[PDB]
Amino acid sequence: PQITLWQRPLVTIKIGGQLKEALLDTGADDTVLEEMSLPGRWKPKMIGGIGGFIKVRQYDQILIEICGHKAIGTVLVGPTPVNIIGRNLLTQIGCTLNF
Amino acid sequence: PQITLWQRPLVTIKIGGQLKEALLDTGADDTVLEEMSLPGRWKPKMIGGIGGFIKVRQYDQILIEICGHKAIGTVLVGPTPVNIIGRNLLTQIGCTLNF
Numbered sequence: 001p002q003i004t005l006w007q008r009p010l011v012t013i014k015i016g017g018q019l020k021e022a023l024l025d026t027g028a029d030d031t032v033l034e035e036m037s038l039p040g041r042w043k044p045k046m047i048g049g050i051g052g053f054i055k056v057r058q059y060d061q062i063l064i065e066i067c068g069h070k071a072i073g074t075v076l077v078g079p080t081p082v083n084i085i086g087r088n089l090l091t092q093i094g095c096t097l098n099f
Numbered sequence: 100p101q102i103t104l105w106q107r108p109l110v111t112i113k114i115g116g117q118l119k120e121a122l123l124d125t126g127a128d129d130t131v132l133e134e135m136s137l138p139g140r141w142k143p144k145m146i147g148g149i150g151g152f153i154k155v156r157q158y159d160q161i162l163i164e165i166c167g168h169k170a171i172g173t174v175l176v177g178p179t180p181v182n183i184i185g186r187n188l189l190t191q192i193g194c195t196l197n198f
């Protein structure tokens with residue numbers, strides 16, 4: 001599909017059998033989701049944003065369906081304002097900016 | 100141009116005579132530029148994202164050229180780590196997300 005930016009680029013993602021709303025974020029290198037339980041081990045990761053750094057937990061090889069497109073990759077869980085789909089997952093579903 | 104997301108989507112913008120490097124960010128409602136002097140009067144505003152909030156100066160009706168495409172809108176100036184072009188200006192140059 002082609003998504004214009006007159007409103008927030010929100011999509012519903014399916015993770016762990018449940019639906020969530022996430023924002024397509026080209027300015028985010030990584031995908032960060034709000035607090036939730038994911039399987040396996042996690043390793044630490046410091047990520048910088050607009051207001052500074054935060055420490056999040058990194059989970060690798062996580063199945064996540066974005067707008068019907070299946071992706072398997074790294075997901076970071078931490079105190080984020082909203083679920084953010086970053087470039088690591090945008091490239092997997094073949095997302096590009098055009099103008 | 101069609102921009103891929105394998106790398107950060109950085110472009111050259113021209114504002115106040117000088118050329119700068121900015122990140123195209125579909126996740127940002129607004130546009131924030133690093134500390135610089137712009138003419139006109141401003142209003143304080145607090146913006147927040149990952150890491151927390153920062154105080155910025157809001158200037159309205161600022162003219163920016165994004166890849167040659169002129170655009171006009173609200174521009175925030177403050178302690179941001181990178182210049183970020185948000186939705187307010189991306190729509191003006193006809194930028195869309197495709198997948």
Ligand SMILES: NC(=O)O[C@@H]1Cc2ccccc2[C@@H]1C1=CN[C@@](Cc2ccccc2)(C[C@H](O)[C@H](Cc2ccccc2)NC(=O)O[C@H]2CCOC2)C1=O
Pocket residue numbers: 023025026027028029030031032047048049050081082084086122124126127128129130131146147148149180181183185
């Ligand atoms: N409210 C709103 O729309 O946007 C807010 C307010 C605002 C105003 C102007 C500009 C940005 C924003 C903010 C905002 C938008 N998207 C985010 C996420 C967000 C979205 C909605 C609400 C809160 C947070 C992330 C930016 O894309 C940011 C860009 C960045 C890149 C590099 C360094 C610093 C900042 N990247 C970043 O944190 O990178 C990472 C997180 C995972 O990988 C790393 C962000 O922080």
